[PDB]
Design a protein around this ligand. Sequence first.
Ligand code: HEM
Length: 291
Amino acid sequence: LVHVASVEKGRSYEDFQKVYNAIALKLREDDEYDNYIGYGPVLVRLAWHISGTWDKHDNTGGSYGGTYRFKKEFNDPSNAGLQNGFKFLEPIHKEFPWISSGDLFSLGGVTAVQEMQGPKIPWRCGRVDTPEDTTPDNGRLPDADKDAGYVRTFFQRLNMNDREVVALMGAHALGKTHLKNSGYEGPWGAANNVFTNEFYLNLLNEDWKLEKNDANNEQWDSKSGYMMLPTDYSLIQDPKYLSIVKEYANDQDKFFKDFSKAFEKLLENGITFPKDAPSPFIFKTLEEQGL
Ligand code: HEM
């Protein structure tokens, strides 16, 4: 497979900045979702799950085709709870019917990180909707009940190295786990709709206790009322991952710079960009525009 990026016919930077502004205004407005966390966290989880199906060996999956819109991927057990993010974006797609599904789903993730005071993420347009038979089969997204060796091996399929894996996992400062979606329950931290290096500081400074939860799954719980998945706690059990966790815990700016690069790479895997194509767009926040 080759997937060539094709700009939506006749659209420029200003068009995409209007879709970003529509998503960001609705993030502001629907602030009550999930006990006042807001939709920002489920939207960056949606952008990672539609990208995370990519396989570097045959170029299948990834964000390009927008195939989450199809039943098979939509109903994947690993995507439980993402229907909420889909439903959020659906009025925005009726307002801007020209944008492709993969461009809308990935842009939702970018808009959410930046509106939650995160780093600017360069974003490229050009994903093209592909047919229902290009939809990847279920089972390509990662399990949470595993160790550092599984994590390393998993992310190799998306050719992410150690630094990129640790930077990307820092998005778990956002939102929370929900028992009915995944068999896990609880937040990773206190400031869960502000993008900060809090995940790393919690992993290094809390007194974590291994416990079983109500779904019979294990998770690491702290006195503070926070939790960590087996795969998160893996990052301090592996010596290579632990030196990077310490780095980001001591330097949020380095975490932001590395997260920015790794998240753009994740959203663009599998896509070939012609050099006639526009450079990556840097969108302004509502705040920068006075809106
Ligand atoms: C080995 C890797 C990963 C595993 C096993 C994993 C697993 C999970 C699980 C089990 C949840 C809870 C779902 C729920 O009950 O609602 C979750 C939530 C979330 N994940 Fe991850 N994750 C991984 C990587 C990532 C990455 C790479 C990102 C983003 C760059 C990410 C972003 C999120 C976000 C923001 C949420 C919160 C969503 C919400 O609050 O509804 N995760 N993750």
